Amino acid sequence: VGGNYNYLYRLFRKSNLKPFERDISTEIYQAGSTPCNGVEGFNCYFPLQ
């Protein structure tokens, strides 16, 4: 009823994943000139969804 938000999927990445490759790193995605040294906002986003 809640939605079962336990399952997650990666939405933001810089490269197309190679076959049979895994990306577990949850580092903050950088989508702009901002250094994105943590504390994401207006240019940095959480990679997972």
Partner 1 sequence: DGYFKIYSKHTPINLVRDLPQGFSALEPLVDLPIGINITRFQTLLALH
Partner 2 sequence: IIRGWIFGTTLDSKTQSLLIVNNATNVVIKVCEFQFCNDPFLGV
Ligand X SMILES: *[C@@H]1O[C@H](CO)[C@@H](O[C@@H]2O[C@H](CO)[C@@H](O)[C@H](O)[C@H]2NC(C)=O)[C@H](O)[C@H]1NC(C)=O
Q: Which residues are at the interface with partner 2 (CB under 8 A)?
A: 22, 24-25, 27
Q: Which of residues 6-45 bind partner 1 (CB under 8 A)?
A: 18-22
Q: Of the candidates 45, 35, 44, which has an alpha carbon nearest to the alpha carbon of residue 10?
A: 45
Q: How far is the CB of 14 from ligand X (least distance, A)?
A: 3
User: Which residue is closest to ligand X by CB?
Assistant: 14
Sign of CA dihedral 13, 14, 19, 20: negative
SS3 46: coil
Contact positions vs ligand X (CB under 6 A): 14-15, 17-18, 21
